[PDB]
Structures are given as structure tokens and as C-alpha cells.
Design an enzyme around this catalytic site. Structure first.
Site: not given
Ligand SMILES: Cc1ccc(-n2nc(C(C)(C)C)cc2NC(=O)Nc2ccc(OCCN3CCOCC3)c3ccccc23)cc1
Length: 357
Positions: A26, A29-31, A33, A49, A145
């Protein structure tokens, strides 16, 4: 073993616990899936993820480690919470992949904006967003963001904040959910290179709030320079006091733009765009507009705080201290993340973070 099975997803392999079934990609990206899956044990849909060998280089490693550490510091119903973290690799020497599991939500805020929302739904969404933001801020995390595509919702109007940055590139990117650029939601202090505090997120919530009402992006600039034009055209030229905090080059640029008086909020956000069936809707419309006028303030020193916003008449109808005052387990500390590490060390740090979860 016999705990893990493999499946072909994208141009890659998901090796996951047998409890996760029916994997569908769904997001890519590079970092990372992300797949949708059914959790047979929990009896619910989940999102998984995959971070593929996050230690492959310094950029990937720091981002994988930061994600694991940030998610360790939060514990709130209105922020992403991990249901599971695992690796199919059994030792450090062979460790390769990290998998993160969260609850599958029904939609993101992008898909909510052009629905006919009433005050009760709008104020509740806003309330939850604010609760989530307050939790992050007390954990020492500024989101930076906050935009509609980083906010996910369920059919019961419940809401979570996440960060779906996957370092997307032309080859790698794929989305089954709408995306929006961050630009439209960046506070002016970020745009003008000022250095910022936690209330950049309050600006973003106001942008999101206004969009929920108008159905259109509030400040839709073509680039970072143009964002500023869109800001001043509506809110007006900021004070000399504010301009005094700018670096000389940015300061003179800002002074050179045409002067704007700013449009009255009664005019920017008229009664007719809000719900108005009853006299009580009229009251709520005035409260919503007032709150909007206090979030969309160019000067962060004059902008409403998350604390004050939660107490605002528009929001306080939902206020429960168990939600709006819930403390994070700890405050995020960037010390080990900002330490330099050889790849082998990053590998072990990330490994330990997983095994400890
Ligand atoms: C480098 C980096 C550093 C930190 C982050 N970061 N920072 C935060 C805070 C600030 C809110 C605490 C949260 C996150 N990380 C995330 O939010 N990670 C994720 C994003 C989207 C996802 O799935 C999206 C799909 N969506 C899921 C919900 O149901 C509908 C589909 C994910 C699915 C499973 C596990 C992690 C997911 C991210 C990257």
C-alpha cells in the site's frame, strides 16, 4: 523456527510471522515498504512496514534508529502505536530486516476534507489532533510534517498522527493512499529560516482546520518563496517586531514585498462555509473562527499554545484529562542518534532496539 514464512511483495520479500496473512502493498519508498495484512491472532487488519537492511548506509541507519527510538517515547491513542516489532533473523551477525506493525486505519484526512462535516465531528477531530500533538511535545518531539496525509482516521471518527515519510524516489514510490506536500502546512518561521519551537505544529493544525472547512488548501503556494506571498496576502504583513527576528537577507526580502492589511477572519472564513442549521451552530462557528484566528498567527510568540487550544470553547466540550493530560513514558533524547557510528555499530544499536521491544 517454523515461526516465519516468506512472500513476494513489490520487488522484494516480506519474511513475517505466520500470524500476518494476505499481504498487500500500500506504500513504497527508498526507506521503507508498507503492506496491509490480516493479523490472525488479533483478528484485525494491520499495516506492516519493512525497513530493508536499514544499516546499508549512514543515512538509512540513522533514520531507522530514530524511528524506533521516537516510537519508544510515545504512548497515546491519538499517535501511532506499534502492535509489534520483529526481525526474522536470529542473531546479530545475520541481522538484516526490521518489521513494524500498527493497526490498519480506514482512511487518511485527505479523504475526509471534502465530506460534509458538522461542528461535532470537526471539533472532535481537532481535539484528538491537539491531544496527540500535546503528547508529542511533552515527549520532546516536534512533528514538523503535520499535514492531512500524516493523519489517519477510522469510521468512528477516531484519529491518529503518524509520519509516512518513506524517502520516496522515482523508481521506488507507490501509494494506495493520497499524499500532499508539506509546504502548504509549514509555519512562516520555518519558511523564512528562523528557527522554531513546538508551536510550528499549531500553525499546521490551523491550516488543516481551515482546509476542513473551506475544502481547499489555505496557503497553496507554488514554492517556499510563494508560500510567504500567500500567507501575507490573507493574514497581512507581520509586525516590525517579528521582522526583527529575521536574518538580514530574509529580513530585507520580507520588507520588500507589497504591504498587505490582511483580510478579516469573518471574511476569510464566512458563516456560510460553516454548518448553520441551528442557533447552536452559529455559536460553534464563532468559536471555530476564533480558534482559527489564534492558530494562524504569523508570529509564533503570539500564536496559541496546544495547552490553550485544548481549553478553547470549541474544543473543551470533548476534554477528558485522561486523554489530554496523558504523559509520555519518557522524553526523546537525540544523543545516541547524533553520535557517529560505523555501520556495524548502527547495526547493533538497531538490533538491540528490536530485541528489546
Ligand atoms: C525516519 C522516520 C522517523 C520517525 C518517523 N515517525 N515519527 C512519528 C511521530 C513523529 C508521529 C512519533 C511516527 C513515525 N513513524 C511512522 O509513522 N511509521 C509508519 C508510517 C506509516 C505506516 O503505514 C501507513 C499506512 N496507513 C497505516 C494506518 O492505516 C492506514 C494505512 C506505518 C505502518 C507500520 C509501522 C509504521 C508506520 C517516521 C520516519
Amino acid at each position: 523456527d517454523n515461526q516465519f514464512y516468506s512472500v513476494e511483495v513489490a520487488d522484494s520479500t516480506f519474511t513475517v510471522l505466520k500470524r500476518y496473512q494476505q499481504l498487500k502493498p500500500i506504500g513504497s519508498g527508498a526507506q521503507g515498504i508498507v503492506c496491509a495484512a490480516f493479523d490472525t491472532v488479533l483478528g484485525i487488519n494491520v499495516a506492516v512496514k519493512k525497513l530493508s537492511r536499514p544499516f546499508q548506509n549512514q543515512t538509512h541507519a540513522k533514520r531507522a534508529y530514530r524511528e524506533l527510538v521516537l516510537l519508544k517515547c510515545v504512548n497515546h491513542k491519538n499517535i501511532i502505536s506499534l502492535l509489534n516489532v520483529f526481525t526474522p533473523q536470529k542473531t546479530l551477525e545475520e541481522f538484516q530486516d526490521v518489521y513494524l506493525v500498527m493497526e490498519l486505519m480506514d482512511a487518511n484526512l485527505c479523504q475526509v476534507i471534502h465530506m460534509e462535516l458538522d461542528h461535532e465531528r470537526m471539533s472532535y477531530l481537532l481535539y484528538q489532533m491537539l491531544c496527540g500533538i500535546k503528547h508529542l511535545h511533552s515527549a520532546g518531539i516536534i512533528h514538523r510534517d503535520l499535514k492531512p496525509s500524516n493523519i489517519v482516521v477510522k469510521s468512528d471518527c477516531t484519529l491518529k498522527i503518524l509520519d509516512f515519510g518513506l524517502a520516496r524516489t522515482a523508481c521506488t514510490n507507490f501509494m494506495m493512499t493520497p499524499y500532499v506536500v508539506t509546504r502548504y502546512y509549514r509555519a512562516p518561521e520555518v519558511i523564512l529560516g528562523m528557527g522554531y519551537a513546538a508551536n510550528v505544529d499549531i500553525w499546521s493544525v490551523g491550516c488543516i482546520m481551515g482546509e476542513l472547512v473551506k475544502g481547499c488548501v489555505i496557503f497553496q503556494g507554488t514554492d517556499h518563496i510563494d508560500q510567504w506571498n500567500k500567507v501575507i496576502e490573507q493574514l497581512g504583513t507581520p509586525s516590525a517586531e517579528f521582522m526583527a527576528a529575521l536574518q538580514p537577507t530574509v529580513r530585507n526580502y520580507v520588507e520588500n514585498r507589497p504591504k498587505y492589511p490582511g483580510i478579516k477572519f469573518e471574511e476569510l472564513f464566512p458563516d456560510w462555509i460553516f454548518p448553520s442549521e441551528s442557533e447552536r451552530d452559529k455559536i460553534k462557528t464563532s468559536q471555530a473562527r476564533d480558534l482559527l484566528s489564534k492558530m494562524l498567527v504569523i508570529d509564533p510568540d503570539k500564536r496559541i499554545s496546544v495547552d490553550e487550544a485544548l481549553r478553547h470553547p470549541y474544543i473543551t466540550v470533548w476534554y477528558d484529562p485522561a486523554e489530554a493530560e496523558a504523559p509520555p513514558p519518557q522524553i526523546y533524547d537525540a544523543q545516541l542518534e547524533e553520535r557517529e557510528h560505523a555501520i556495524e555499530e548502527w547495526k547493533e544499536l538497531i538490533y538491540k532496539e528490536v530485541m528489546d521491544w
